[PDB]
C-alpha cells in the first residue's frame, strides 16, 4: 500500500507521457484511426482507472 | 514540501509549471515544419 | 539535405539552454550577493 502506491502513481505518469505522445500522432496519422483508436482507449480507462486508483491509495499513506 | 508520500516527485512538481509556456513554443516548431 | 526546422529547434534550445544557464549562474554565480 505504502510500497504498492509509489509504483501505482509512477505508472500513471509513464502511462500519461505515453498517452500524450499517442493521441497526437494518432489524429495526425489517420491511416490507423481504425486500429490506434484502441491504443487511445487502452490508456484511457486504464488512465482514469489508474487515477481513481491513486484515489483510495493516497488517503492511505499520508 | 508536498505530502510525505510524494517525496519522490519534488523534481517533477518542480517543472510542471513551465509547460503552459512550452505550448506557444511548440506552436512555432510546427509552423516551421509546415513552411508557413 | 537535413530538414531546416530540425536544425532551428535544436539550435534554438541551445540558446534557451545556454541562456537559461546564465540565469541560474546569476544566482550562485560569483555575481550573487553571498
Amino acid at each position: 500500500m505504502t510500497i504498492l502506491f509509489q509504483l501505482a502513481l509512477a505508472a500513471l505518469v509513464i502511462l500519461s507521457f505515453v498517452m500524450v505522445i499517442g493521441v497526437p500522432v494518432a489524429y495526425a496519422s489517420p491511416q490507423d484511426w481504425d486500429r490506434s483508436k484502441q491504443l487511445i482507449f487502452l490508456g484511457s480507462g486504464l488512465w482514469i482507472a489508474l487515477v481513481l486508483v491513486v484515489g483510495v491509495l493516497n488517503f492511505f499513506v499520508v | 514540501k508536498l505530502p510525505e508520500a510524494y517525496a519522490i516527485f519534488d523534481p517533477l512538481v518542480d517543472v510542471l509549471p513551465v509547460i503552459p509556456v512550452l505550448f506557444f513554443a511548440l506552436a512555432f516548431v510546427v509552423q516551421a515544419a509546415v513552411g508557413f | 539535405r537535413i530538414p531546416l526546422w530540425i536544425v532551428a529547434t535544436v539550435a534554438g534550445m541551445g540558446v534557451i539552454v545556454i541562456v537559461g544557464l546564465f540565469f541560474y549562474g546569476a544566482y550562485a554565480g560569483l555575481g550573487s550577493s553571498l
Partner: peptide, 28 residues
C-alpha cells in the same frame, strides 16, 4: 536534485510529436 533530467524528456516530448508526424504523414 535529479529535477533536471526528468524535465529534459518532457521538453523534447513536443518536437518528437512533430518528428513522429513527419515520418508517418498527415496533418496536411
Amino acid at each position: 536534485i535529479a529535477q533536471l533530467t526528468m524535465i529534459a524528456m518532457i521538453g523534447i516530448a513536443g518536437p518528437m510529436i512533430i518528428f513522429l508526424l513527419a515520418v508517418r504523414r498527415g496533418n496536411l
